[PDB]
Design a binder for this molecule. Structure first.
Ligand SMILES: Nc1ncnc2c1ncn2[C@@H]1O[C@H](COP(=O)(O)OP(=O)(O)CP(=O)(O)O)[C@@H](O)[C@H]1O
Ligand SMILES: Nc1ncnc2c1ncn2[C@@H]1O[C@H](COP(=O)(O)OP(=O)(O)CP(=O)(O)O)[C@@H](O)[C@H]1O
Ligand SMILES: [Mg+2]
Ligand SMILES: [Mg+2]
Lengths: 211, 202
């Protein structure tokens, strides 16, 4: 009846982790909104007040300011749908989308369909997807690969997706773009007590694990 | 036992995963809903009214400027909407804000400061706050009360905030209560003597 106390303190902690990362989500999200979006909207107000001043005397230019308000409302709307999506992907869907990305990059898509996992949640599933997006985006974008092999495997407690490629690695200890592509991926695996692994030994072999 | 009894534990850790994924899902779904709807609709509006004003410039300028007063205000309103959402993204703070709400409604604020709890998280704390907002908003707004008493109590596993008032019951609150039910806390209301609200949270 002491080891069970150990379980009450440790559980307190395994709930705490959950809340203080849901907060990662929160703050980062209000950051995007606040910044990108709100700045766009301020811009819209100012350019439309300006065009409103121009109407009578410089109309040719009021219409230009207004072409600009038009486009900033556009871009703001795209930013919104971008968020929304960063909140709404499908696994078997990402498979098709990257299938197209590489097919298009003139890269060979080796996928040997296996056992589609059962022990996976949908926060987990969506994270997995994302890491798919950035791993393939990075392969296409950099590797120099001519082949990419994607293994989705139910394995034990967790799904594992390895994304391998033959190309050469362009990465130096800076490359790890502080809070960007691969760092986003890997911190994002570390939080859900999964993990990201990379073996540059033979081209570049990526590896994602998630309960 | 340990092996068979053990595996159930799993049946429960994981049963529990399945459960709290519904807070993520339909927290982010309320959020994408608000964005999508309110905001995106506003932005479409902006595009259309500015394309229109752009057509008017030359022939009907007096009215291009009117459409444009409109684009101006819709950018405003859109920005405020973004605000609501960033803000949603403090307990002792809510205390001051409602202190003002009721003080202003000509309602008496009985608060007898107690033991500020320790066993509380901040998802919990912020939920508590919110329910404060809607309970007091509802009291001011409806009760007919002339007094409101707020008890914040560390109690056992969980903080408990009762918001009582003398007024009559005329029966927001579903948001409050489902939102307590999810964090295995609870909402209780006793209309027996005016209206007495009660929130509990681990
Ligand atoms: N498959 C690969 N082949 C060769 N080089 C690679 C590679 N994958 C990654 N790299 C190198 O490592 C660097 C770090 O990648 P990372 O994804 O962190 O930044 P990035 O350049 O992909 C933009 P983002 O911030 O969107 O990821 C890359 O810039 C690239 O130079
Ligand atoms: N403190 C209170 N005392 C007596 N009746 C109350 C009350 N708070 C709410 N009610 C009654 O219950 C109804 C439901 O409350 P609820 O909070 O869902 O709606 P509301 O009328 O407060 C506006 P909103 O839902 O937008 O906050 C109210 O219409 C009111 O008649
Ligand atoms: Mg990258
Ligand atoms: Mg109400």
């Amino acid at each position: 009846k002491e080891r069970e106390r150990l379980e009450e303190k440790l559980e307190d902690a395994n709930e705490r982790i959950a809340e203080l990362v849901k907060l990662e989500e929160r703050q980062r999200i209000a950051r995007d909104l606040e910044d990108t979006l709100g700045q766009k909207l301020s811009l819209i107000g100012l350019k439309s007040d300006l065009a409103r001043k121009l109407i009578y005397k410089d109309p040719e230019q009021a219409a230009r300011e207004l072409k600009s308000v038009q486009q900033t409302a556009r871009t703001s709307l795209n930013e919104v749908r971008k968020i929304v999506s960063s909140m709404k992907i499908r696994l078997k869907d990402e498979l098709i989308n990257i299938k197209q990305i590489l097919e298009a990059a003139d890269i060979m898509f080796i996928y040997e369909e296996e056992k589609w996992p059962e022990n996976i949640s949908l926060l987990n599933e969506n994270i997995l997807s994302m890491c798919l997006k950035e791993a393939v985006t990075n392969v296409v974008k950099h590797s120099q690969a001519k082949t990419c092999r994607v293994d989705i495997q139910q394995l034990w407690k967790e799904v594992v997706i390895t994304v391998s490629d033959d190309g050469t690695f362009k990465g130096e200890e800076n490359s790890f773009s502080k809070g960007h592509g691969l760092l986003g991926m890997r911190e994002r695996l570390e939080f859900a007590n999964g993990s990201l692994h990379i073996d540059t030994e033979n081209g570049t072999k990526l590896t994602m694990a998630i309960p």
